[PDB]
Every structure is written in structure tokens, then in C-alpha cells.
Amino acid sequence: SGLVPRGSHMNMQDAYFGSAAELDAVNEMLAAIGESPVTTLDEDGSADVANARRILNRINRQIQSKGWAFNINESATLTPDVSTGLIPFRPAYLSILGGQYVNRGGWVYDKSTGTDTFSGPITVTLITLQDYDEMPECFRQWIVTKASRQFNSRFFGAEDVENSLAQEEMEARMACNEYEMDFGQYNMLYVQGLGR
Amino acid sequence: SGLVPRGSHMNMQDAYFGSAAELDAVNEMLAAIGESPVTTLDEDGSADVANARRILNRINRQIQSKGWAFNINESATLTPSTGLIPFRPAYLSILGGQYVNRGGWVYDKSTGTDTFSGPITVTLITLQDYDEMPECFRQWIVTKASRQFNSRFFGAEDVENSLAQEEMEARMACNEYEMDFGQYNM
Amino acid sequence: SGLVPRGSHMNMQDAYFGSAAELDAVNEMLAAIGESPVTTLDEDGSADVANARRILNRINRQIQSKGWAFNINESATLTPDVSTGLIPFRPAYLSILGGQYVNRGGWVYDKSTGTDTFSGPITVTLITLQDYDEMPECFRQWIVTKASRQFNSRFFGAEDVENSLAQEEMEARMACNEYEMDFGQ
Amino acid sequence: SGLVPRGSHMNMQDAYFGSAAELDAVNEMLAAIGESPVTTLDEDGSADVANARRILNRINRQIQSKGWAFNINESATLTPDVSTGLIPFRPAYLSILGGQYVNRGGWVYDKSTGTDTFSGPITVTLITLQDYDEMPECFRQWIVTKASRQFNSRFFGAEDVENSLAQEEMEARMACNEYEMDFG
């Protein structure tokens, strides 16, 4: 097939990665706001840690769901269960491009006939959520800055932090749009056709 | 998702926090009308200290009781034993028009009870201290109280004009905040 | 006490008022993005008019459904069909507070006994939808400005319109929030 | 809702709008490259005009066919001809979402059932091509700039034009990507 993301995350079950990379990002958000870093997230005393984690996760998902070159599995072949005919829509999946295949209850559902059972494999273009050490630097900068900005604004309101972050976010956001101009916006309009 | 307030204050029993952050805000009110700061709020004498503290508390409650992103818990769970659930001093409001406070206890008015089969998940507004809210809100609250304290007891004109400008600026910033974060509904 | 909303709209059968007030509010959204006003909302079949009207309706219902001093009736008594014993939950009703009565059909369904059907006898806190000339000016301005901003953003994307409308919405919200704090608690 | 595109274009006969908005966009491509504007798009004569118009149409179709909040009708109802059962797949139609219905030879074709004839109306999610004055400003700027760059690159090769157009495209794309994330 085609190019894949750095992380496949096939066994992700929770909303969060629970990783060193996620901790580092949350610790950056805390720092921005004047709070000292923690050694684990998991574990679950403070409101500020929990809130930063949540804000970060939502922004991460919102930006990644658009779909970009680094988080796209260009030609993913999905094979149904032999007995049930089912294909799980796994928790790390953000979207199947095209408007035909959607998540219904944790299962890939085909709108062309109205079914979640398949007699053979399907090949689709899939967006898979990546962790912060699995994306280009410009994306980690845009997501973690945007999250820091929101965390500041919602709970703290330090204006020097806001002015500073607004500028860093603008710059990362321009860099991510320059990326997309180089790599292209995937459109479903196999790998060869994916021409756009 | 769900985000919580920075302060939970479950063991708050009085009307006041009694914190350093409270003292700093009262001291700003006193400075605004030319009185000197105090090192504690534990009843000192001083009618001006007491009055500032009370005006500040009332304005704080009034503003915070509207419900804002920073003091709303969208999924707070309250477990009742005796069936009963206390409505604590830090609770301002449970949104939605079903549960309310009956002399210190949560009253479920879908059934007219205040005893509960299990536990409940509600949307709850909880009073935050001055170091637990965004700067714009502290500014609005503290400036509004300062102005009220001036007008009620002193009436200095240059204070009034100055505070009025600051209150208006804070109030715009708080309305911008809510446009960014949204008003909760249901 | 008991004060009532200015509009009860019992005969309202579809989603829209169809009123002169609605027409004015739509013409205002049209003026904001540079289009000409219309003389009626009974189109054919201008897309812009249909879209403005839907967006405006949705925002109106959304903001009003919170419940405010101007659109709550703390003791609305509703009376059944008798025969069927059935109480409609009408287009103009946004919600019944308290947690017991809810919209099944709509009807009206007592979620604490059965039961779609009633002997008489029912008194209730009702939030009812007001028309654009039946609310305080600040709420009309909020609803219309917010609707105008969604209409712009989705279909037009004019940056100066957005900036200007955003400061108008903020002004309206500042007045509605004073209203909410003044009448509430 | 319930919301519909600004333009339905049910009577478009060919690939092009023929409109003042189309003319103005082609004139902008001509200006980017140092050529004078024209008063109309079919005379013809002009190779540059014909090529700019084709490039612009192709880019316009390609970007729009993704489907956006401004050009999706979530419940378009299409009604078959009574005698024939057929439903034309019109030139302004870009796609029908879901994987069931496609354009086969100019007719709406249900590829799941394996039929292009229908006993009554169908209601579908239709993406319909908008004119340059019927889309949000950031999309017109994206499409016209992109088209300008392809026209330059293929026939002119002016490097200063490419550098300046590439900045303006990036700026437009940034606004269109905020739109996509805001309306997604």
C-alpha cells in the first residue's frame, strides 16, 4: 500500500495515551501558567493537572481530526471478523475519509448499503491519532501552544502569557499551513488516485 | 470534558474563605478609599474592615452565581446513610431547575423528596476564591466592591470616576470571556 | 407575581412566527451581509432568506430555552383534551421545569406515574418562545447579532462584518448579563 | 437545519457559469500574469482566456468537491422523470455523499442496487458547485490564487509572481482551514 502514521495505537482503549510525551506536554502547560511540573498524570490529585490534560486532549483531537499527512494511513486494508463480519472502529481512529464509512457504536459502518457487516476486506483512507513524539515539530508547537493559551484564558488570565502564546500559536499555525501546501490536503473526491 | 473549578471547598463552613487572597482583595478596597491595610480579617475593631469584607462577599456571590466556565462543574456527583445530601456554603446553584436548596439540603422537585435512592450527577456552580478565578473576574469583582464601598460610606469623586472606568473595562473583558467559553444551557 | 410572558402563542402550529417582527429581524441579517430586504418571508425561494430564517430561529430557541424572567410562566395551568385526556406540547413551548413533565409526543408526559393522560388538572413552570418584538431590546439584539454572525461566517466570510458584529454582540450580552443578575437568584 | 447552498444552478448547461463573477476571476488571473482584462469570456480568439478559464474551472471543481458547509445540502430531494425513471446528474453537481449514488454517463446511478431508474424521489446529501460570489471570501481567494499559480507555472514561469501568489494562497488556506475546523 501507501504511507502510514508513525503510531498505529491498535490497542489504545482510553481517551489518553498515558505516555512520557503526554506528560511533557501537560508539564509545559503548567509551566506556562506558573505551576510546577508533576511526575505522573495518572494518579490524579489536582484539578489543574486534570484540567490541563483534558484541554490538551480536546485541542489535540480537534486539530488532528482535520487530517494531515503525518496522521493519514493512505490505504488501510481492514479485514472483518470471520464469524461476525464486524470491523472495529478503534479508539485511536479519528475519521475514515470520504463520507461513506462512519463509526456506529465502535464499529465501521457502511452508509452505501447501511451495514456494519462485511464479507471481505475494505480499503480506506484513515486518520489515526498521534502522540506528541509522533508528529512534526510544527504540529506539536501549534497544539501545545493553543492548549496552553486556552488553559491560561479559561482559568488564569495572565496577559503577558496570553500575548506571548498568541504569537507562538500564530507562527506554528502558519508553519502547519505551509506543511499542508507542501504535502497536500487529502480529498476522496487506489494510492495513485489518492492525484486528489 | 469535564473540566472542573480550581477550588472545590467541600469543607467550607462559613461565608468566608479566610484566606490570604481574601485579605489582599479587602486591602485593595481599603487602599482605594485611603485607609491603611490590615494583616488579618479576624474581627479587629474595625467597622471599615468588616464592612469591606461583607460588601466584597455579597458582590462575589452575586457575580459568581450566574455560572461561568471557571466555576461550573458539569458533572459533579453527590452521594447521600440517611438519604440526605447537604447543600454546602460553597455551592451557589445547581443548574437546570430540578434540584434546589431546602434549608441546607438538596431537594429533588421531580418527586418533591430530599432523600435519594442512589447518588446523582448534576451541573453545579461552586464559589471560587480570588486566586481561583481569571484575572478579569477578580478585577470586575474587586472593583465593583471597591466602588460600592466608596459610594456607600465615603463618596470621594475622583475614586468613583476612576473605579467606574476600571469596572467597565473588567466587565467588557468578562463578557468577552463568556463569548469565548460560552454560557452553559441545561 | 404571577407575571406572564408577553406572548403565549397557543395557536402557533409550525416552527416560525410568520410575523412582521420576524421579517424585520431577517431583513436586518440580510442588510448586515449586504443583501436587499424582502417584503415577505413566504418565498419562493431565495436561499439567503430561507437560510437567515432558519439560523435566526435556531439561535432564538437556543438562547430563549435557558429561561428568563421575560419568558417563564411560573404557574401555567394546562388542561387536557378530555376524551383523550391529552395535553399537547406545542411548538412555542421550550421546556417545563422541575423534572417531572416532559415532551413525549409532544404531548406532555408525566415521567412520574405513567402516563400520557390526565383527569384535569395541571399547573407548571413553562418556558415559552417569544417573538422578536416580545422580548427586552437587549435580548433581541443579542439573538439577531449572533444569528447575523453565524450567517456571515458560514456563507460570506466578510472579516469587517464579523468584527463589527462581534462588538455589537458583546455589548448586547453585557446588557443581558446585567438583566440576568438583576432579575435572578 | 435544513440549511442549503446559496446557489442551486439547476439550469447550468455546461461546465461554466458564464457569469460576471467568473469573468472577474479570470481577469484576476490575467492581471497576475501581466495581461489585459477582457469584457467577456466567449468570443473567443484568446488562448490565454480559454486556458485561464479551464484551469480555474478545474481547480474550482476540485476544491469544492471535498464538500464544505457552504456547498452541502444535507436533504436534497431529486425527483425522477415520470416516464423514464431517470434523474440527471447535472453539471453543477459535484458529488452525492454516502457511497450509494454516483454519476454514470450524466445520470444518477445507484451503484449499490445496480440501477439508474427510480420509481419515486430520493433525498440525499448533495455537494453543489458554487459561483465566486456564492462562497465565503477565503474560499474564493484560495481557488483564484491556486488557479493563478497553476496558470503562471504552466505558461509564464514568472518567479516573483509565484512567490507572491504562494504567500496569498497560504493566507487563504489558513482562513479556509479555520473554517473547516470551526464548522466540522
Residue numbers in the entry:
A (entry chain A): -8 to 180, 185 to 189, 191 to 192
B (entry chain D): -8 to 71, 74 to 179
C (entry chain C): -8 to 176
D (entry chain B): -8 to 175
What is the paper's account of this structure, in its own sentences?
The KP32 bacteriophage belongs to the Caudovirales family and can infect multidrug resistant K. pneumoniae isolates. Analysis of the KP32 genome revealed the presence of three tail proteins that are predicted to be involved in the bacterial infection machinery: tail tubular protein A (TTPA), tail tubular protein B (TTPB), and tail fiber protein (TFP). TTPA is a structural protein that is located in the bacteriophage tail core; it is necessary for the adhesion of the phage to the bacterial cell wall, which is a prerequisite for host infection. Interestingly, although TTPA is considered a structural protein, it also possesses the depolymerase activity described in this paper.
All four monomers are folded almost identically. The TTPA molecule consists of 192 amino acid residues; in the electron density map, however, all of the chains have an additional nine expression-plasmid-derived amino acids at the N-terminus (numbered −8 to 0). The electron density maps are interpretable for amino acid residues −8 to 175 of chain B and −8 to 176 for chains C and D. Thus, about 15 residues at the C-termini of chains B, C, and D are not seen in the crystal structure. In chain A, most of the C-terminal part (except for residues 181–184) is visible and forms a well-defined α-helix. The solvent water molecules were classified on the basis of electron density and B factors into 885 fully occupied and 10 half-occupied sites. The structure was refined at a resolution of 1.9 Å to an R factor of 18.3% and an R free of 22.8% in an isotropic mode. However, the TTPA molecule has an additional domain consisting of two antiparallel β-sheets and loops, which lacks in gp11 and gp4. Moreover, the crystallized TTPA molecules adopt a tetrameric structure in which the helical domains are directed toward one another to generate the hydrophobic core, while the loop/β-sheet regions are directed to the outside; thus, there is relatively limited contact between monomers. Our Phyre2 server analysis (confidence 67.3% and identity 21%) showed that the antiparallel β-sheet region (residues 57–99) of TTPA may contain a lectin-like domain; as such domains interact with oligosaccharides, this finding suggests that TTPA could display glucanase activity. We therefore propose that the D121-X-D123 and D151-X-E153 residues of TTPA may be good candidate catalytic residues.
